[PDB]
Design a protein around this ligand. Structure first.
Ligand SMILES: Nc1ncnc2c1ncn2[C@@H]1O[C@H](COP(=O)(O)OP(=O)(O)O)[C@@H](O)[C@H]1O
Ligand SMILES: [Mg+2]
Lengths: 788, 754
DNA sequence: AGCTGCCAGGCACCAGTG
DNA sequence: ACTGGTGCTTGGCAGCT
């Protein structure tokens, strides 16, 4: 192998290796003329991933250099293939002029595309958030931060233990996760996508405080409510440094950060989120989830928001009452408002492209279209007497001046890119109309010259055309070419035609080309100038989009409440849940038979229910629908019952029945309070007969007598139906079944008390177990029943 | 695209690829279904590039979709069960076409491997066996009749193909099958009185033929697979034993990942067929045993040679179909060149069956030499552009080539001549399709082009010209190359004519080579992995000394613990108590895997295995309802020659219900069915079973508490267990001390009545 | 509407003359 | 050192059929 010292390198590879050195573990797309190039292992890897040719750049001194590339104009399709696989890519461009550089033109990395910093519409899913996170660990707990680069939403939390951290990763589901190198609990994090090991120094607290204050223009973070939170600040500081390093521009839409405190929301553990099938079902799909039912938002930014609420229920009584109020007030207005809200589109994401100075012409066109909907929205919402609706109406704004600007500046349907022009409209800049008019008293001139020269020469094949490589020409066929004026300067020869130039045409070529380059250069100057006039209003524009997304969510929840027959729940002072004719929101829509509504009464005196009933009798569904009603109540939605009264809930824990069951259970026992809702679904496993049930008993007992949480405790262990007897706060309910001769009917109705019996043998027979075996099993059963 | 509609009507069940430019494009419901299947975008249009079409055919074909291609009319169709091109197939995985049909009596089933010509027919007697045959054979494409009643069997399957009833008519099937095989009746195949089976085989054969529009001379035979010739295993058993596929859908940590170090793709595919179909006939088994023992010493020598043989089976299919490409003939040649050496190595082996495989392997010396002379060392992928036929094979071809090379030589000397005369260092001769041969000169020098040069094309920095002299020799080069290209193709088609008469003997060779690869591998595995030769007894029984689980013992870096087993008619059920934690399950599954391997003819991971006949293996290992439904299947179908492994049934319902079921099953398995059974349980009350009845005994696993953990020992010991560990595992996991203390009190109180 | 092959714009290489 | 020719990815499209 060759000693690759600096001097043994060509000027090209000197520069290239300097720049790859600053990006040693990621693919570097390196601009040379019309191509992005890769070298060495980048080329080999790119070749395998992207399905392009692996070639060689020849070398005078040494071994050939592996090489691959793509034309600059095809870059975004390739960037998409890469980022979809979790690959980052540094984009290196030419800064300088080749004509004034002796050696290689100056080259800089201008951006890095990574899975959690993308903002382009082609690389994202419309209805799903794409978050960058950072995480780190102390001896005591975790700091965690999230950034949605394509809306500027920047958050910080400090999950106190392992399980809260598992729960947070599941909630936020980052596309890319920066973690510190000394991270101990790797089981939380390994086998996630877009994992990015970072050095310790990027989590340093003084640096974080410094960069965040600089980003926000503040002396301190007191006003944001995070000066208190160095654990979280350390993560947020890593995150911000990564974001600035990927974008390499200012980020004026990141103007704020907020701490998500434990107390602010209901904290659902990892099992609970999975078990309720909120946005993801139990097989990874998005069908048959709570979102598949509640989500008929008409804008992308609203679909995202609704899913954020579903996942993070709020404990602020005022916010909830305000949301409920809104939903009752808009019930009659949904049909008129939705088709209009739809037309606003995904303004949030456009505003981020505007902030990053990346917005394309169709973004400004959709921004303009959106502004055009604001008066119709304003008019429709005026009539609605509800202060919260009016507060949104106000916050959404109007932006008359900016709407006018975009109507006058850009044409009706502009092209996808500004690169080829045809974007700025006539009337907006007079210097531009003058340059376009010189390259447009042009198509007409070439025709009159064609006809004039055809008639003058007498040569009827004479045509005038253009060719990018050779320029304008007069063409005569081969058979007539020998008759051409001797004045005609030969320019391009073809198999069956000859092409010429004369000074009149050459002078007209020189004027059309230099005035096209002036028209385009000035279009680009003016289009960048649209950003300068929009940007000052960014703060108010971002508030408008969030208002519009909220509107979309609530208008939606109003239509859902109507169409699906939901009521307004009420909040009470003490823990408790009173449901009348309650229903599983999801199961009631997918079942092709009537859903049996069910009550529930939980209070501080009636705090644990031991639920029995046969397998397939409805014990899990009844538990889940309780949690779903609680969750819907605490995002502000109407709920799928005929009446619900509900007290404060701090946390929802779930255990759905090895070392893992007993560990999850201990978490519940260490961290549940009198304000928690606890769903235990057939827990207690051991290696012998009574082993695991005894544990279940002692656990039920600790939940009832010490923690005093509100617990639904589904079991197959009939012995646990003795607990009410011995234990203040516990009672039996059950799922009713009937045995009419040789079969079982599942009624799906909760009744008070323990069931008459268990039905393990009935269910057994239903499953086809031979009748001779069930006969002996009953005989044995009666032996056991005679014990007492 | 008003013309697209009329071509979609022609085949409305199949996806239509529709050529335009570099792409094939799909519209309406084809585009929708194709974008979710393949990963591509919408517009209703999706499209694929031309240079990768075979890749997207392979992916759609792998998912059960037939595909028609249009170039204007439908010129080619690929169906999932009838492909044979190597780009579309997976090297180490069988691809079957199947037909199924149903009588008032029972089922008819047929399978075909279009590449090998392996054609099978069965008549599964009931619902459960039919389900077992479908999961085992896993056809890529499945023809069924319109009136098929039991749609629950096939509903979920990829590549379903609804078919008219008349395709399953018996007299037509008999007739087409007799014609295909050159026979007057099917007695010589032993299927003459299997009319349900034949109806399935006739529909299948018709469909194959229709998709090929070609004779299928490699399909010369059919066999019938009978119930009693194999150990039956339902899907759940097959899945639990992790034969070819693991529970997560992959190929790792599987029985095949450990046993299948074969060296040819055809041998690997045959080994996997053997693993999934253990046979009851000990005659066949003994021969495989003897061969495995006789080949121990020859293994290091044989395998590097056999690896060079490659996939002769699949290359041969393409010879049968007349689609074999130059590297297929070149690999066939390469395989013929190994036979002398394999013949020499095997001559010494003391084994009638190895000597039979050695005869059947053949030599084909005359075909070896034919392709040595006919084709060059490393021919190009396609015949299309020539350069495949060797120089010296045909005199006429050598002359056209010399005439081309002499005109090509002339034009190189013309280049140097014109370059010397004019004094123009940039002068050169090139060639392309538009201008044929031309003289190029750069733009800076082109103004000194001789006046006899006729300009033809201006480039940005060059001018190309012609002269009469140039066009003259172009004509020599081009006409020569054209005659030699047409001659190469005619000579290539002639190789097929000379090779194909030996097709039958060549399919025997590839098959023998495949078997040898299986056995040479199994012999290397027996010797490498310390396996031993099992013996067979006349009555049911399993006696294992230091048995091991073959996958677990290679996969984990912790000492594997070997265990005995003694099952006989006097001792036919073991009640296995103690912690499970993997140990009971592994012990039970290694029992099944040893039995399965004994019944493949392999050596087995043990110091000693004696084993009686086994008709079925049932392993219900690892909702309550699905657990009870699987138990139901055992109790309805197991016999006194069955092996039954059951993992702690009763869990998921109440203590007394579940204990009553477990008790009553055990009784039934021991007193009525009399299977050989390992009955794993958590119920201590079941350890009283040995006192209450004959042929039942107690064993157990225990654990050792030390330092701050627990070591769950994997050693099976005599007697009931006397410890539970649920509570000890709760303490370790951090369940508060006071909770455990209370659980201990309640445990004692609960167990004390019992 | 298809198929072949020049071109884009960087920089290096290479071979002939200062 | 300086002059003028070459080559290299892929995708667009001219220039021939
Ligand atoms: N209230 C109800 N009305 C109608 N069907 C129900 C109801 N609750 C549950 N089910 C259905 O019955 C089946 C069993 O429900 P499940 O909650 O799993 O019972 P369990 O957990 O007790 O075995 C599921 O298909 C479920 O959809
Ligand atoms: Mg359940």
């Amino acid at each position: 192998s060759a000693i690759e010292n600096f001097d043994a390198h060509t000027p090209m590879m000197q520069q290239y290796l300097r720049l790859k050195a600053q990006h040693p573990e990621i693919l570097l797309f390196y601009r040379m003329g019309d191509f992005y190039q890769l070298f060495y292992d980048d080329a080999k890897r790119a070749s395998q991933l992207l399905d392009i040719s692996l070639t060689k750049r020849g070398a005078s001194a040494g071994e050939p250099i592996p090489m691959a590339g793509i034309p600059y104009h095809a870059v975004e399709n390739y960037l998409a293939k890469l980022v979809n696989q979790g690959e980052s890519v540094a984009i290196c461009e030419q800064i300088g002029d080749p004509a004034t550089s002796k050696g290689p033109v100056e080259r800089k990395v201008v951006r890095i595309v990574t899975p959690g910093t993308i903002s382009d519409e082609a690389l994202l899913q419309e209805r799903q958030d794409n978050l960058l996170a950072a995480i780190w660990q102390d001896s005591k707990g975790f700091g965690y931060a999230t950034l949605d680069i394509s809306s500027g939403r920047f958050r910080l939390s400090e999950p106190a233990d392992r399980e809260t951290m598992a729960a947070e990763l599941q909630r936020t589901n980052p596309a890319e996760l920066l973690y510190a190198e000394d991270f101990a609990e790797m089981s939380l994090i390994e086998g996630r996508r877009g994992l990015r090991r970072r050095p310790l120094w990027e989590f340093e607290i003084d640096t974080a405080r410094q960069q965040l204050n600089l980003q926000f223009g503040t002396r301190d973070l007191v006003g944001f409510g995070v000066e208190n939170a160095p654990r979280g600040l350390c993560a947020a500081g890593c995150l911000l440094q990564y974001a600035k390093d990927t974008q390499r521009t200012t980020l004026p839409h990141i103007r704020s950060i907020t701490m998500e405190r434990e107390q602010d929301s209901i904290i659902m553990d990892a099992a609970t989120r999975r078990n309720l099938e909120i946005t993801q079902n139990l097989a990874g799909g998005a069908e048959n989830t709570l979102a598949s039912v509640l989500d008929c938002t008409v804008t992308p930014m609203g679909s995202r928001m609704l899913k954020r609420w579903l996942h993070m229920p709020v404990r602020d009584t005022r916010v909830l009452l305000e949301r409920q109020q809104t939903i009752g007030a808009l019930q009659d207005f949904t049909a008129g408002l939705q088709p209009v809200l739809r037309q606003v589109g995904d303004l949030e994401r456009i505003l981020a492209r505007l902030a990053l100075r990346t917005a394309r012409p169709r973004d400004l066109a959709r921004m303009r279209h959106a502004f055009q909907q604001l008066p119709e929205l304003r008019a429709q919402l005026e009539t609605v007497d509800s202060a919260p609706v009016q507060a949104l109406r106000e916050k959404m704004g109007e932006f008359a001046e900016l709407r006018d600007l975009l109507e006058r500046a850009i044409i009706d349907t502009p092209p996808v890119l500004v690169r080829d022009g045809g974007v700025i409209a006539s009337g907006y800049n007079e210097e531009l109309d003058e340059w376009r008019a010189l390259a447009d008293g042009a198509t007409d001139y070439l025709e009159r010259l064609e006809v004039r020269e055809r008639e003058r020469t007498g040569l009827d094949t004479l045509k005038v055309g253009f060719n990018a490589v050779h320029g304008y020409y007069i063409q005569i066929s081969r058979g007539q070419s020998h008759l051409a004026p001797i004045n005609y300067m030969r320019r391009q020869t073809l198999k069956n035609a000859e092409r010429y130039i004369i000074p009149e045409l050459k002078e007209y070529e020189d004027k059309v080309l230099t005035s096209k380059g002036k028209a385009l250069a000035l279009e680009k100057q003016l289009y960048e100038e649209l950003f300068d006039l929009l940007l000052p209003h960014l703060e108010a524009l971002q508030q408008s989009a969030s208002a519009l997304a909220e509107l979309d969510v609530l208008v939606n929840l109003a239509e859902r409440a109507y169409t699906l027959n939901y009521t307004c729940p009420t909040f009470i002072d003490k823990p408790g849940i009173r449901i009348t004719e309650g229903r599983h929101p999801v199961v009631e829509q997918v079942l092709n038979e009537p859903f049996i509504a069910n009550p529930l009464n939980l209070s501080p005196q009636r705090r644990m229910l031991i639920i029995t009933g046969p397998n397939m009798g409805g014990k899990s569904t009844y538990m889940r629908q309780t949690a779903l009603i609680a969750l819907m109540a605490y995002i502000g939605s109407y709920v799928p019952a005929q009446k619900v009264e509900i007290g404060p809930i701090d946390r929802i824990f779930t255990r759905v029945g090895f070392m893992v069951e007993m560990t999850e259970t201990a978490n519940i026992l260490h961290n549940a309070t009198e304000y928690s809702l606890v769903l235990m679904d057939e827990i207690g496993r051991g290696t012998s007969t009574y082993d695991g049930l005894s544990l279940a008993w002692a656990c039920a007992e600790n939940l009832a007598n010490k923690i005093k949480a509100l617990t639904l405790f589904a079991t197959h262990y009939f012995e646990l139906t003795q607990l009410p007897e011995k234990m203040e706060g516990v009672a039996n309910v059950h799922l009713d079944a009937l045995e009419h001769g040789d079969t079982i009917a599942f009624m799906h109705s909760v009744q008070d008390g323990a069931a008459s019996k268990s039905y393990g043998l009935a269910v057994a027979a239903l499953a086809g177990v031979p009748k001779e075996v069930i006969k002996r099993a009953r005989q044995k059963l009666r032996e056991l029943e005679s014990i007492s």
